[PDB]
Design a protein around this motif. Structure first.
Motif, short mmCIF file in Angstrom:
data_model
loop_
_atom_site.label_atom_id
_atom_site.label_comp_id
_atom_site.label_asym_id
_atom_site.label_seq_id
_atom_site.Cartn_x
_atom_site.Cartn_y
_atom_site.Cartn_z
N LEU A 120 0.86 -1.21 0.00
CA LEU A 120 0.00 0.00 0.00
C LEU A 120 0.89 1.25 0.00
CD1 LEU A 120 -3.09 0.33 0.06
CD2 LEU A 120 -2.90 0.75 2.52
N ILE A 128 4.32 -3.46 10.13
CA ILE A 128 3.69 -2.64 11.21
C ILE A 128 2.69 -3.53 11.93
CG2 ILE A 128 2.28 -0.61 11.71
CD1 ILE A 128 3.42 0.67 9.16
N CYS A 262 -4.15 1.10 18.82
CA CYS A 262 -5.16 1.92 18.18
C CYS A 262 -6.44 1.97 19.02
CB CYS A 262 -5.50 1.32 16.84
SG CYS A 262 -5.32 2.69 15.67
C1 LIG Z 1 -5.41 1.81 14.10
C2 LIG Z 1 -5.74 2.95 13.18
S1 LIG Z 1 -6.77 2.29 11.83
O1 LIG Z 1 -8.05 1.73 12.46
O2 LIG Z 1 -7.09 3.46 10.90
N1 LIG Z 1 -5.94 1.06 10.91
C3 LIG Z 1 -5.62 1.54 9.54
C4 LIG Z 1 -4.27 2.29 9.50
C5 LIG Z 1 -3.15 1.28 9.36
N2 LIG Z 1 -3.50 0.22 8.40
C6 LIG Z 1 -2.84 -0.95 8.46
C7 LIG Z 1 -1.46 -0.95 8.66
C8 LIG Z 1 -0.75 -2.14 8.75
C9 LIG Z 1 -1.42 -3.37 8.65
C10 LIG Z 1 -0.74 -4.60 8.72
C11 LIG Z 1 -1.14 -5.33 9.99
N3 LIG Z 1 0.72 -4.42 8.70
C12 LIG Z 1 1.38 -4.11 7.59
N4 LIG Z 1 2.67 -3.75 7.67
C13 LIG Z 1 3.36 -3.44 6.51
C14 LIG Z 1 2.69 -3.50 5.28
F1 LIG Z 1 3.34 -3.21 4.20
C15 LIG Z 1 1.35 -3.87 5.24
N5 LIG Z 1 0.62 -3.95 4.12
C16 LIG Z 1 0.71 -3.26 2.97
O3 LIG Z 1 1.55 -2.39 2.76
O4 LIG Z 1 -0.25 -3.63 2.07
C17 LIG Z 1 -0.67 -4.94 2.40
C18 LIG Z 1 -0.53 -4.88 3.92
C19 LIG Z 1 -1.82 -4.38 4.63
C20 LIG Z 1 -2.20 -2.93 4.26
C21 LIG Z 1 -3.02 -5.30 4.34
N6 LIG Z 1 0.75 -4.16 6.40
C22 LIG Z 1 -2.80 -3.37 8.44
C23 LIG Z 1 -3.50 -2.18 8.36
C24 LIG Z 1 -4.68 0.42 7.52
C25 LIG Z 1 -5.82 0.41 8.51
#
Ligand SMILES: *CCS(=O)(=O)NC1CCN(c2ccc([C@H](C)Nc3ncc(F)c(N4C(=O)OC[C@@H]4C(C)C)n3)cc2)CC1
Ligand SMILES: NC(=O)C1=CN([C@@H]2O[C@H](COP(=O)(O)OP(=O)(O)OC[C@H]3O[C@@H](n4cnc5c(N)ncnc54)[C@H](OP(=O)(O)O)[C@@H]3O)[C@@H](O)[C@H]2O)C=CC1
Ligand SMILES: NC(=O)C1=CN([C@@H]2O[C@H](COP(=O)(O)OP(=O)(O)OC[C@H]3O[C@@H](n4cnc5c(N)ncnc54)[C@H](OP(=O)(O)O)[C@@H]3O)[C@@H](O)[C@H]2O)C=CC1
Ligand SMILES: *CCS(=O)(=O)NC1CCN(c2ccc([C@H](C)Nc3ncc(F)c(N4C(=O)OC[C@@H]4C(C)C)n3)cc2)CC1
Lengths: 399, 400
Positions: A120, A128, A262
């Motif tokens: 993303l 993360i 969060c």
């Molecule tokens: C807690 C505040 S929230 O409710 O707005 N959650 C949103 C902000 C953060 N976010 C998000 C970040 C990270 C992850 C997963 C668990 N960790 C992750 N680390 C690195 C990474 F590259 C990725 N991803 C990525 O870049 O694209 C695939 C994958 C994620 C986005 C599926 N993830 C999950 C959610 C969005 C919700």
């Protein structure tokens, strides 16, 4: 001439449909050949849960509480359609729900990152870890909506004005949160940060919700200063509160590799991006000892129907594999077992290196070049990929 | 002979955006368009000098003339009071204007084909509209927290249990929302959809908040069916409610080009991605006449400090430029002025074409190839870029 590692006490929970098949392959090909375990196996397959009246699920939970390490295969949550399919005695509650209710603690999600698989945010080169923590009604017409606190000791009742509706109606709702819940959320978050050796961040909206979100910030800071701050400084890491507005900006400009508590979905974004097969979900109890690891995805029913008809399938096992590695990594920490700690990391590296070398399942190929452009030579089937991991693991452990 | 633009309310701002705002007027607007211009200086020094009377006059002017275009302004904090020796910590000018005009704020990113997106599938903009408080307190120890509705007509009082605290203390809060507020949010959202000729979506959590979020879904559907549905079908567009869970998945699998009404932040994501200079923020009043257009970003203080020290700056003016084009586009619609309508579109095209041709500010270069890999030849400074837009606008308007 055993050559294998002494893993120790691990609670294992077998699951349903496609994940059940992959779960057995992981044990047979990746774990058992290199690691000997005092294994506490419980079958949370839908048929056995029905046969035992879900007693196996409660036993599995009590076992995790005793032995501190749980690894769980994805399970069917019964709906009306499932009751008719398996002729179930009752519509049994979600096994995850039963386990969470008994163990407690905070669920933390972590994505698996490969350099040849898009993200993303392209800047994110390390994972993360996201950790997540009402009475509504219709106001029919004009009137005063108030929220009242009546002390149990029988002292004076306290009343707060929410809104005086002078013309027209609308809606109103009350939310709450207990101190114990916030304390447990804090402890779990600090435990996870030390366990991974990464810094922690709590996000709130305490500028707007000065009392409600203020309580979260305060309880976290109190527990940090008194119990954890010294241990964090020992590992060159830190805890800081952030406003959600600032945290989103900071997080996206960052390269990852931090815990994010969060106050407020992670799954929906993974579903939208098509990366469910590359996300794990670990339940971290606030005692710091007990942990239950599993994939963030379900049993992959659609893939299982194709398998049942004898058709070729390409199901991503990485989430399921990383459930094992995170469990064994925690076991290794509790027991100071550097041999197991190395193996857990080695398997994680082999998994990422294999995908980075160009060998992957269909979902990852589709993620690179779009599903319409994928041909059969672009990816490997479920069994081909597991075989390739097996060969690469043997080579890595030999070195 | 220039174009007769008509009645436009203009609000001058602070620091870096103020410099860019003057360049936009001088180079892009005034050479081609004559305006009955209602200019108000919302610079921090003049606001202090007039005791914020200029801000109230600016608001009343927008209400009268229907079209406002605003440069980013300093919102005083403790540090700003000491910097400018302010008489009082003046309220946010945006807040004062929003309080007087009302309506819903809609954010829209500007998309260029050579500039990456969070989701590569997104080839058209997505327009996000947020609704806009709450009574929170500390629960000191055990006891019963209840929320009570006492009708003004003197009928029976209704009481709901929020939570019975048995084991310790915690926190509790009451939230509300008036029907009029939800109606205004709906109207604004339908007006925006028809104005852009794109479909609308409302996202809620009505599975969990069956009454609270249910009210939003109902009021939207009622107003749609009775007032808007026929006009939507005329432009081959539609309105539908979605669960936030489903909407996020659908939105990301989509290619953009739709309005998204959000009942659960847009700026934070833009700041994180480094694309604040490519997002506009239009306040759409529910009457369908009144509009206040501006950039989603602030005064860009960091860039201004470098400018003050005589250092070279590369500040993106696109957000500020599109504030003018969206304002003039609305003016053109109200007055049936096809000459102004063409110019508004022409300037928007020139802006996108210039970036797509390879001429951009540092933020856009950094977005393509990462900030560490950017060299001075990859981008133009604030004044170089404005000059390039000026030349390309002259050529485009000559061709027509
Ligand atoms: C807690 C505040 S929230 O409710 O707005 N959650 C949103 C902000 C953060 N976010 C998000 C970040 C990270 C992850 C997963 C668990 N960790 C992750 N680390 C690195 C990474 F590259 C990725 N991803 C990525 O870049 O694209 C695939 C994958 C994620 C986005 C599926 N993830 C999950 C959610 C969005 C919700
Ligand atoms: N923790 C748990 O045990 C969970 C329980 N469940 C249970 O799972 C069952 C099925 O739910 P369902 O939503 O279909 O399951 P999933 O959550 O697995 O989602 C199904 C779809 O997601 C994609 N997908 C998910 N995991 C993978 C993977 N490892 N490799 C490749 N693609 C993957 C596939 O999309 P595509 O078809 O495009 O390949 C698949 O068809 C239900 O009985 C439900 O109760 C669901 C969620 C979590
Ligand atoms: N509507 C309004 O009038 C608003 C008012 N403000 C006011 O703005 C002032 C400063 O706010 P601040 O927090 O710095 O937020 P800004 O949005 O003004 O700037 C924050 C950062 O975003 C990036 N950025 C923003 N706009 C641009 C642009 N046009 N081109 C390139 N990069 C850009 C820059 O990042 P980088 O430094 O990496 O280049 C910049 O330093 C305050 O006094 C505040 O009150 C803030 C927001 C709204
Ligand atoms: C209302 C639900 S929310 O509070 O969770 N908002 C989040 C979900 C959507 N989102 C988002 C979407 C769109 C924009 C802007 C206004 N529009 C936009 N359209 C196309 C487009 F390509 C982009 N961008 C992009 O791809 O990357 C840069 C730019 C955005 C992401 C800065 N934007 C804003 C926010 C995230 C918040």
């Amino acid at each position: 001439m055993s050559k294998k590692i002494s893993g120790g006490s691990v609670v294992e929970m077998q699951g349903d449909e496609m994940t059940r098949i992959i779960w057995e392959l992981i044990k047979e090909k990746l774990i058992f050949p290199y690691v000997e375990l005092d294994l506490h196996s419980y079958d949370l397959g839908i048929e056995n849960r029905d046969a035992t009246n879900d007693q196996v699920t409660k036993d599995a939970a009590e076992a995790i509480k005793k032995h501190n390490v749980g690894v769980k295969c994805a399970t069917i949550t019964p709906d009306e359609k499932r009751v008719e399919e398996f002729k179930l005695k009752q519509m049994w509650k979600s096994p995850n729900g039963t386990i969470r209710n008994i163990l407690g603690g905070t669920v933390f999600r972590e994505a698996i990152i490969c350099k040849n698989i898009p993200r993303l945010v392209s800047g994110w080169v390390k994972p993360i870890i996201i950790g997540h923590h009402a009475t509504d009604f219709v106001v029919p017409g004009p009137g005063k909506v108030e929220i009242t606190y009546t002390p149990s000791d029988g002292t004076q009742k306290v009343t707060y004005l929410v809104h005086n509706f002078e013309e027209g109606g609308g809606v109103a709702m009350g939310m709450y949160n207990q101190d114990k819940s916030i304390e447990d959320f804090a402890h779990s978050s600090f435990q996870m940060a030390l366990s991974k050796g990464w810094p922690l961040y709590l996000s709130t909206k305490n500028t707007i919700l000065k009392k409600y979100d203020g309580r979260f910030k305060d309880i976290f800071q109190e527990i940090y200063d008194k119990q954890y701050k010294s241990q964090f400084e020992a590992q060159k890491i830190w805890y800081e509160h952030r406003l959600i507005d600032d945290m989103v900006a900071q997080a996206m400009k960052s390269e990852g590799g931090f815990i994010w508590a969060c106050k407020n979905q992670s799954d929906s974004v993974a579903q939208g991006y098509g990366s469910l097969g590359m996300m794990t979900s670990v339940l971290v109890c606030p005692d710091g000892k007990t942990v239950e690891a599993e994939a963030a995805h379900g049993t992959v029913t659609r893939h299982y129907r194709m398998y049942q008809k004898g058709q070729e399938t390409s199901t991503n096992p990485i989430a399921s594999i990383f459930a094992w590695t995170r469990g064994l990594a925690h076991r290794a920490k509790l027991d100071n077992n550097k041999e197991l700690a190395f193996f857990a990391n080695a398997l994680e590296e082999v998994s990422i290196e294999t995908i980075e070398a160009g060998f992957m399942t269909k979902d990852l190929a589709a993620c690179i070049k779009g599903l319409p452009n994928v041909q059969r030579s672009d990816y490997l089937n479920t069994f081909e990929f597991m075989d390739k991991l097996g060969e690469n693991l043997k080579i890595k452990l030999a070195q």
